[PDB]
DNA sequence: TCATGTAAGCAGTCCGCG
DNA sequence: GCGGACTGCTTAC
């Protein structure tokens, strides 16, 4: 088998590499790497090396990496460019693996762990680590085993061994419901004292050294806690045994409320699952506790225990250990669904970077582009410093706020990367400039053609049409992978709807789910078999279809994110290929493309409908247009339709057969106008939206830019079993809106769009009447809490203190002297509740850590003093007033002359 | 919230306002 | 008690 790296580090003049050899064995080697850099030389001098602009360079081969670094400093002082890859471990990986890496994940040791630490005096700070580690569960992907280290004797209590038999039992029978499928995989190890637990854990770590180290919050808690605890007991040299190269870097973030550390373990790639999740999931959660995220992702219940966690080990050691094990497993279950570790490995090896560098699109692209250029014997430019400079982005149309009955939307495929490819935008493809007209003149095709020789953007830039740019070339590769995976995702999505339709008429039989690949549209024969399946089998199939969809979603959306990352990297000062001419060539072209096609669509629909000057395009943002389809429906006549699906079919065909070809002709003209290298402006139909036929539903509405709601019947070719709300920007979409209010507002919207005003009024009246009965957490607002210190003047609010920060200060004063009260953490999210006048907290609101119950000592007072009137007004009524005034509807029946009668 | 980019909405503070 | 200038936060793309 072909070899592949696991980890790489630079330590002085040495590269330390862990890798898999040709026999599939894990090996480590220290290499005195001899790096090369480059300097421009005279044209007369023969060389195989050229910079990206075709200028000759000489290779400087250095005896060591320090020599190479010192040369860079001297060149800077002389004032000459020092070219080539200055991150030597990237150069090393490129030299060592000069081929497309095929990796075997079964050889890569992926470790997932979490620790428990009983603390009778508040949160156990990793930087201090003054309390015993009393449990560790460490799952090893190669052994497929959960290694459980259990401390039986501690200054905070001596306890009996944990029971696997009791652990497996149902919670309703006094057990802990440790899942049956991992019971056989647990290796339990009790210890009579902390020192032997920790020594054994280190010995174990040596035998089974993680390559990828993950878990929930491991970077900020478990790793620095373990490191500092070992350091305190045994000394730092023993702590450094956590690094296969015995090298660590400790970085301390000082703060007004307490300092914390992050530990770099040389020779390990730490991918904290919370960071993976935040980067790759495309959610914004109100809380990032594992309980909340597990509930969100897996629909499993909160891990219930009585009393504080500081007393759980002593009162119920049995459950304490089971919960530690289950928490480790939950992360594994989320990853089985989401597949972020797989993605990280895919991306890391593709780029030839340290796996942890997947978090940085700038590092990722620098490596991809370096490897690409190196193949052609080309030499990369030196990284330069630039001042931060704002620059223009996309265009967003101002919509007329209103209800909109029938809407069809259209969207450009992968816009920014497509612009890069179409225009041929790269550092080395720049051909010159042309004198710009106002953008409006290009949009309306009155400006003179920019060039009949080069490929142009309306920002004034011209590019070579005949040479391949490294940026377009490498962006195309990832785009094509993105396209493949999005195909698999949409197929699984369509397949899911086939199963949902078949669930309306399940069969009374004992059968099994069909063995099929959900990444491909079901054949006619499979669809026939599905129509005869039982509910049990259909439900299992739907689960499998949805899991396939989620895997496709992970794969496509993050490759989309990577290529989009390159377009913005051009406008980031730390990017080697930073250049506002290119960043701006992209965004400006986008602005033109959107407004050009709005004109073309308005022109086309007026023509086919036999009118002039009517505005069909009602809205657009960046690369999308929203087309009012009312006149289309009216041209044929509503009564001509049998049911909802008939008019949806009609509009789907109208868009594909009439509109899309006109859209294509429009963009082909624009491509000729700009003399671009390749036509890649592909704008396909996205949503078909409207009210159910024969209903009083309004179909959709806009309140403003980035704020709208649509009742969607078909999305990108997925014909839904049941209509689906597409809501953008409104409070239902914001993580700061209370959970129960999101729900109530969404149903208000559903009623407006599908049923009409009277239905809305009925629901509003009910919610208003019942809302005081909702659980306090469900009606609490949420906010991130940044710069808490700045506004903290002797426990009271300073000037311009934000509302949520005021709530934290109110909380801090309320929990003073209470050692068991959870502290609010800087930068994390809080629940927020307004308080009534005269409350014992002495202020207008309170805030506490999100995803938790407020501490029992002040909970009673919070419930008593909650200002429901204010909560309803601010979070529910005011947003709803926004939706309904825009929609020209009322949520309350208003007074009229009819009130004089007894109805 | 350690990690490409800009556009742009709403909540809230402070200030003005016979 | 509402509007403008300002920060903070969050979402759409
Ligand atoms: C969603 C998103 C878009 N953008 C930019 C780049 C996109 O090309 C542009 C349009 O956004 P989108 O239309 O959402 O995405 P896309 O055109 O790149 O991909 P597709 O429509 O095929 O799914 O806005 C970002 O920079 N960051 C983002 O998170
Ligand atoms: Ca725990
Ligand atoms: Ca798009
Ligand atoms: Ca059936
Ligand atoms: Ca879009
Ligand atoms: Ca599309
Ligand atoms: Ca109390």
CSV table of C-alpha atoms (C1' of nucleotides) in Angstrom, one decimal, chain A residues 219 275 360 362 393 568 572 705 784 786 800 827 844 874, chain B residues 1-14:
chain,number,residue,atom,x,y,z
A,219,UNK,CA,-9.1,21.6,23.9
A,275,UNK,CA,-14.9,23.3,16.9
A,360,UNK,CA,-8.1,27.5,8.1
A,362,UNK,CA,-6.2,30.3,4.1
A,393,UNK,CA,-19.5,43.0,-1.8
A,568,UNK,CA,-12.8,35.7,0.2
A,572,UNK,CA,-7.7,38.7,3.5
A,705,UNK,CA,-34.0,42.9,2.7
A,784,UNK,CA,-23.6,35.7,23.3
A,786,UNK,CA,-18.8,39.4,25.0
A,800,UNK,CA,-23.8,51.8,27.3
A,827,UNK,CA,-17.8,34.7,25.0
A,844,UNK,CA,-34.6,45.0,35.1
A,874,UNK,CA,-40.8,42.2,22.8
B,1,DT,C1',-16.1,33.8,19.6
B,2,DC,C1',-9.1,30.6,16.8
B,3,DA,C1',-10.0,29.9,11.8
B,4,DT,C1',-12.7,33.4,3.7
B,5,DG,C1',-15.2,37.8,2.5
B,6,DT,C1',-19.4,42.0,2.6
B,7,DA,C1',-24.6,43.5,3.2
B,8,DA,C1',-27.8,44.5,6.3
B,9,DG,C1',-31.7,43.8,9.7
B,10,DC,C1',-33.4,44.6,14.9
B,11,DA,C1',-32.6,45.3,20.1
B,12,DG,C1',-30.9,48.2,23.0
B,13,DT,C1',-28.4,52.8,25.3
B,14,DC,C1',-28.1,57.6,25.3
